Write a protein that holds these residues in place. Structure first.
Motif, PDB file in Angstrom:
ATOM      1  N   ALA A 139      44.206  39.546  33.500  1.00  0.00           N
ATOM      2  CA  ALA A 139      44.022  38.822  34.766  1.00  0.00           C
ATOM      3  C   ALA A 139      44.434  39.740  35.923  1.00  0.00           C
ATOM      4  N   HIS A 140      45.504  40.511  35.764  1.00  0.00           N
ATOM      5  CA  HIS A 140      46.051  41.417  36.808  1.00  0.00           C
ATOM      6  C   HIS A 140      45.016  42.500  37.111  1.00  0.00           C
ATOM      7  N   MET A 141      44.362  43.031  36.082  1.00  0.00           N
ATOM      8  CA  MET A 141      43.293  44.049  36.245  1.00  0.00           C
ATOM      9  C   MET A 141      42.141  43.443  37.056  1.00  0.00           C
ATOM     10  N   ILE A 142      41.709  42.226  36.712  1.00  0.00           N
ATOM     11  CA  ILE A 142      40.589  41.535  37.413  1.00  0.00           C
ATOM     12  C   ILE A 142      40.984  41.221  38.871  1.00  0.00           C
ATOM     13  N   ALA A 143      42.211  40.763  39.114  1.00  0.00           N
ATOM     14  CA  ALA A 143      42.748  40.502  40.467  1.00  0.00           C
ATOM     15  C   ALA A 143      42.706  41.793  41.298  1.00  0.00           C
ATOM     16  N   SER A 144      43.016  42.937  40.687  1.00  0.00           N
ATOM     17  CA  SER A 144      42.977  44.271  41.342  1.00  0.00           C
ATOM     18  C   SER A 144      41.544  44.597  41.792  1.00  0.00           C
ATOM     19  N   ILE A 145      40.522  44.280  40.987  1.00  0.00           N
ATOM     20  CA  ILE A 145      39.098  44.588  41.329  1.00  0.00           C
ATOM     21  C   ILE A 145      38.673  43.706  42.508  1.00  0.00           C
ATOM     22  N   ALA A 146      38.826  42.386  42.389  1.00  0.00           N
ATOM     23  CA  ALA A 146      38.858  41.444  43.520  1.00  0.00           C
ATOM     24  C   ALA A 146      39.848  41.967  44.574  1.00  0.00           C
ATOM     25  N   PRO A 178      45.972  31.165  37.579  1.00  0.00           N
ATOM     26  CA  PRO A 178      45.659  30.025  38.440  1.00  0.00           C
ATOM     27  C   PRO A 178      45.148  30.419  39.839  1.00  0.00           C
ATOM     28  N   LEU A 179      45.347  31.674  40.252  1.00  0.00           N
ATOM     29  CA  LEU A 179      44.914  32.181  41.579  1.00  0.00           C
ATOM     30  C   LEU A 179      43.441  32.604  41.517  1.00  0.00           C
ATOM     31  N   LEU A 180      42.880  32.846  40.335  1.00  0.00           N
ATOM     32  CA  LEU A 180      41.519  33.424  40.194  1.00  0.00           C
ATOM     33  C   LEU A 180      40.502  32.295  40.008  1.00  0.00           C
ATOM     34  N   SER A 181      39.387  32.349  40.726  1.00  0.00           N
ATOM     35  CA  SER A 181      38.210  31.467  40.513  1.00  0.00           C
ATOM     36  C   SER A 181      37.000  32.353  40.241  1.00  0.00           C
ATOM     37  N   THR A 182      36.731  33.301  41.146  1.00  0.00           N
ATOM     38  CA  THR A 182      35.479  34.097  41.175  1.00  0.00           C
ATOM     39  C   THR A 182      35.796  35.573  41.398  1.00  0.00           C
ATOM     40  N   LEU A 183      34.977  36.455  40.836  1.00  0.00           N
ATOM     41  CA  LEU A 183      34.950  37.905  41.150  1.00  0.00           C
ATOM     42  C   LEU A 183      33.648  38.160  41.925  1.00  0.00           C
ATOM     43  N   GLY A 185      31.998  36.245  43.950  1.00  0.00           N
ATOM     44  CA  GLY A 185      31.114  35.069  43.893  1.00  0.00           C
ATOM     45  C   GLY A 185      30.811  34.582  42.484  1.00  0.00           C
ATOM     46  N   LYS A 186      31.154  35.346  41.439  1.00  0.00           N
ATOM     47  CA  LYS A 186      30.864  35.008  40.018  1.00  0.00           C
ATOM     48  C   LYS A 186      32.078  34.326  39.396  1.00  0.00           C
ATOM     49  N   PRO A 187      31.907  33.154  38.740  1.00  0.00           N
ATOM     50  CA  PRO A 187      33.023  32.435  38.139  1.00  0.00           C
ATOM     51  C   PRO A 187      33.715  33.277  37.055  1.00  0.00           C
ATOM     52  N   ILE A 188      35.045  33.241  37.049  1.00  0.00           N
ATOM     53  CA  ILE A 188      35.863  33.932  36.017  1.00  0.00           C
ATOM     54  C   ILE A 188      36.293  32.895  34.983  1.00  0.00           C
ATOM     55  N   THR A 189      36.163  33.252  33.707  1.00  0.00           N
ATOM     56  CA  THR A 189      36.728  32.495  32.573  1.00  0.00           C
ATOM     57  C   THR A 189      37.552  33.454  31.704  1.00  0.00           C
ATOM     58  N   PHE A 190      38.611  32.936  31.098  1.00  0.00           N
ATOM     59  CA  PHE A 190      39.510  33.682  30.193  1.00  0.00           C
ATOM     60  C   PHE A 190      39.327  33.115  28.791  1.00  0.00           C
ATOM     61  N   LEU A 191      39.037  33.972  27.819  1.00  0.00           N
ATOM     62  CA  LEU A 191      38.852  33.534  26.412  1.00  0.00           C
ATOM     63  C   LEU A 191      40.148  33.772  25.628  1.00  0.00           C
ATOM     64  N   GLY A 192      41.284  33.859  26.314  1.00  0.00           N
ATOM     65  CA  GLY A 192      42.601  34.070  25.688  1.00  0.00           C
ATOM     66  C   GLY A 192      42.863  35.529  25.403  1.00  0.00           C
ATOM     67  N   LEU A 193      43.986  35.843  24.771  1.00  0.00           N
ATOM     68  CA  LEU A 193      44.339  37.248  24.440  1.00  0.00           C
ATOM     69  C   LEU A 193      43.557  37.718  23.207  1.00  0.00           C
TER      70      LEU A 193
END
Ligand SMILES: C=C1C[C@@]23CC[C@H]4[C@@](C)(CCC[C@@]4(C)C(=O)O)[C@@H]2CC[C@]1(O[C@@H]1O[C@H](CO)[C@@H](O)[C@H](O)[C@H]1O[C@@H]1O[C@H](CO)[C@@H](O)[C@H](O)[C@H]1O)C3
Ligand SMILES: O=c1ccn([C@@H]2O[C@H](COP(=O)(O)OP(=O)(O)O)[C@@H](O)[C@H]2O)c(=O)[nH]1
Length: 405
Positions: A139-146, A178-183, A185-193
């Protein structure tokens, strides 16, 4: 559903993608696992009970003037030969037409494509198949790209996708998920670890590295591995070797050879002689899961690839972190923030390291009684989340539900 999965030609992508294929096939879904024939031949066999639900679709790499035959993955095409990396990216982009013809008659409900699969997302648009972009990091990596840079391949793939998929969960990253919705404009989903099922890797538990571990005391061995592809030049191999010697711990070291470096130049003069019996260097693919599962391994010196991060923590190993590129910096800072590891000190200016920083990081995580004990207790707390296999299965059921909608 029929799900088509197209991993990047890299074992840190092929391996979790095959695990995912088998988890979908376990719930009665059909998967077409699309890659190149030598990469497929080197993967662990599918459980026989899933055999007809995971179809391997071998598209041969186009021959590109000077790219050697069989050089299909980032494990075969070295980062220290950027001319050859570029030739490999051209061969990869050449899969565009064979892939678009395949998808036409595949009756696919979903395409799941990796970060550089811009042509596969375009085929998905052409054939009106929903397309999920795999971003199977934190999630931290994806937040960094956003031709094209890695950034343009990524942006083109992202622009053509309707869904982005990460490999984490609120339980591991409650401050980010909980802070992430979209990258973009594209919806983000997490499939777990999605930590690997130890059996699923089908390793050799009679491997010489594991028989060596059997003779070592509990939690005494520092396992050293930098994944399947990051470069480490010979001068940096020498600094990591001498650091391992200076900290004085037992070690098992899975080392890849920098291109054009003889066996005689690989390691510092007399290093193997001086560490014989206390440490083993293996310059071949090792059974990493059987090693991390072993009672003798204490600390993990890791480049902080996301697979190695999850695998290390799922067996409660504190991390000594030597990130090289890509998401490894963010991965390393994420685990440091949870007190479950320590980065090797780096020079601001070049990002270089030396034997003394390596040794100091090993001492603090693995040797000094007070610090080592805190690192182990904090890695153990992370293991409660990472090794919660039931929790991670429920996240796969959650991802399948996301895809039906
Ligand atoms: C998993 C990844 C997606 C990635 C796409 C590009 C992206 C990222 C870099 C994140 C920040 C925005 C952006 C657009 C950028 O280029 O700056 C993103 C995360 C890491 C990435 O890594 C790549 O992984 C592969 C194996 O896992 C390597 O086969 C590849 O070669 C790495 O690419 C590497 O990227 C590094 C960081 O820019 C470079 O230092 C390295 O040279 C490059 O190879 C590259
Ligand atoms: O000698 C090796 C080197 C790597 N791995 C496995 O290869 C993957 C490496 O992925 P990671 O994300 O850690 O790093 P990358 O290779 O993508 O840089 C992990 O699943 C490791 O268990 C292994 O089994 N043996």
């Amino acid at each position: 559903m029929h799900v088509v999965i197209c991993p990047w030609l890299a074992f840190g992508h092929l391996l979790p993608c095959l695990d995912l294929a088998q988890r979908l096939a376990s719930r009665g879904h059909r998967v077409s696992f699309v890659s190149t024939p030598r990469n497929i031949s080197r993967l662990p066999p599918v459980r026989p009970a899933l055999a007809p639900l995971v179809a391997f679709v071998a598209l041969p790499l186009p021959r590109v003037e000077g790219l050697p035959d069989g050089a299909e993955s980032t494990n075969d095409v070295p980062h220290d030969r950027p001319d050859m990396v570029e030739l490999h990216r051209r061969a990869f982009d050449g899969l565009a037409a064979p892939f678009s013809e395949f998808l036409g008659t595949a009756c696919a409900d979903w395409v799941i494509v990796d970060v550089f699969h811009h042509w596969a997302a375009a085929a998905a648009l052409e054939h009106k198949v929903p397309c999920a972009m795999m971003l199977l990091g934190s999630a931290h990596m994806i937040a960094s790209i956003a031709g094209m840079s890695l950034a343009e391949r990524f942006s083109l793939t992202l622009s053509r996708s309707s869904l982005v998929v990460g490999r984490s969960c609120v339980e591991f990253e409650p401050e980010t998920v909980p802070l992430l919705s979209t990258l973009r404009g594209k919806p983000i989903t997490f499939l777990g670890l999605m930590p690997p099922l130890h059996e699923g890797r089908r390793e050799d538990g009679e491997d010489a590295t594991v028989r060596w571990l059997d003779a070592q005391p509990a939690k005494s061995v520092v396992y050293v591995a930098l994944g399947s592809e990051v470069p480490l030049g010979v001068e940096k191999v020498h600094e990591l070797a001498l650091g391992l010697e200076l900290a004085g711990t037992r070690f098992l070291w899975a080392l890849r050879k920098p291109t054009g470096v003889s066996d005689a130049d690989l390691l510092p003069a007399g290093f193997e002689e001086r560490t014989r019996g206390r440490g083993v260097v293996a310059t071949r693919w090792v059974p990493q899961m059987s090693i991390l599962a072993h009672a003798a391994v204490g600390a993990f010196l890791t480049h902080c690839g996301w697979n190695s991060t999850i695998e290390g923590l799922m067996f409660g190993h504190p991390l000594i972190m030597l990130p090289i590129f890509g998401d490894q910096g963010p991965n390393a800072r994420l685990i440091e923030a949870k007190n479950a590891g320590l980065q090797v000190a780096r020079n601001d200016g070049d990002g270089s390291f030396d034997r003394e920083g390596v040794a100091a990081a090993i001492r603090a995580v693995a040797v000094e009684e007070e610090s080592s004990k805190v690192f182990q207790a904090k890695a153990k707390k992370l293991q409660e989340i990472v090794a919660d296999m039931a929790c991670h299965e429920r996240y796969i059921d959650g991802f399948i539900q996301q895809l039906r909608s």
